[PDB]
UniProtKB/Swiss-Prot annotation:
Used as a detergent protease. Sold under the name Savinase by Novozymes. This is Subtilisin Savinase. Belongs to the peptidase S8 family. It is found in: Secreted. Ca(2+) 1 binds at residues 2, 40, 73, 75, 77, 79. Its EC number is 3.4.21.62. Its main location: secreted. It comes from Lederbergia lenta. One of its GO terms (biological process) is sporulation resulting in formation of a cellular spore. The keyword Hydrolase applies. Residues 5-268 form the Peptidase S8 domain. The active site is at 32 (charge relay system), 62 (charge relay system), 215 (charge relay system). Subtilisin is an extracellular alkaline serine protease, it catalyzes the hydrolysis of proteins and peptide amides.
Length: 269
């Protein structure tokens, strides 16, 4: 049996699916620990920028989980993504421990731009700024990619990098009461929030697992962007980003929530 995780319902993805919107034709790069082959995922391509590791398979689990929130297949098993027909690309920029570097993340962003990705999901952070990182975000954006990045899990009133850079759409996490999760970073640069507590998704070894984090919120927004892109194929990254914000459900102050809770039904009306 297929289960619909609470966050998928909370962002109203099933209503978009009922209008025939699934993310078909939209290329979504997952810049993460990899993506493992799984009966509830389709992986269309990718590249690894982790030294010594040619495989894009997931050595950790995190990237497979993120990928399933974006695009777990709509069938009779497992879970269900926001954009279950999105074309997933596994862009491995984080090693098995979850660590990365500015250079691996930047290389993945440049790859996403050069390979015509429409959305790049960055469920990752760096605590300190990096001009190589901001420049890579800007490069991908200039080529047409919508970069979507996690605000971070430190609980602080500033957000992580690259989410803090203007051309990354920064995503915080909400709980089942539609409150900001206590760990979800907020402040200057935050754009939007999405479910990030007790999020069930795909995991390696043909399993499923439940995780908490802004890394889980981010793919709800990446998936919603793919639904908007399928409906509006001529729209740019910016147009999609601002439509998601303009159709979000306000949750209160923009400092804490950005524009509020992403709403895939409102965004595809
Ligand atoms: Ca499924
Ligand atoms: Na930003």
């Amino acid at each position: 049996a297929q289960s619909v995780p609470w966050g998928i319902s909370r962002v109203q993805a099933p209503a978009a699916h009922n209008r025939g919107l699934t993310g078909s034709g939209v290329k979504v790069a997952v810049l993460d620990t990899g993506i493992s082959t799984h009966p509830d995922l389709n992986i269309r391509g990718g590249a690894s920028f982790v030294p010594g590791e040619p495989s894009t398979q997931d050595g950790n689990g995190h990237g497979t989980h993120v990928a399933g929130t974006i695009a777990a297949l709509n069938n009779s098993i497992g879970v269900l993504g926001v954009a279950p027909s999105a074309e997933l690309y596994a862009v491995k920029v984080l090693g098995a421990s979850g660590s990365g570097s500015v250079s691996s993340i930047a290389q993945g962003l440049e790859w996403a731009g050069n390979n015509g990705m429409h959305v790049a999901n960055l469920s990752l952070g760096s605590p300190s700024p990096s001009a190589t990182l901001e420049q890579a975000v800007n490069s991908a954006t200039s080529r047409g990619v919508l970069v979507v990045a996690a605000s971070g899990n430190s609980g602080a009133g500033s957000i992580s990098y690259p989410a803090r850079y203007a051309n990354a759409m920064a995503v915080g996490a909400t709980d089942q009461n539609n409150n900001r999760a206590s760990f979800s970073q907020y402040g200057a640069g935050l754009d939007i929030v999405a479910p990030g507590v007790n999020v069930q998704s795909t995991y390696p070894g043909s399993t499923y697992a439940s995780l908490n984090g802004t890394s889980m919120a981010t793919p709800h927004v990446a998936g919603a962007a793919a639904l908007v892109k399928q409906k509006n194929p001529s729209w740019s990254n910016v147009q999609i980003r601002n439509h998601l914000k303009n159709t979000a459900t306000s949750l209160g102050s923009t400092n804490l929530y950005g524009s509020g809770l992403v709403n895939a039904e409102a965004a595809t009306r």
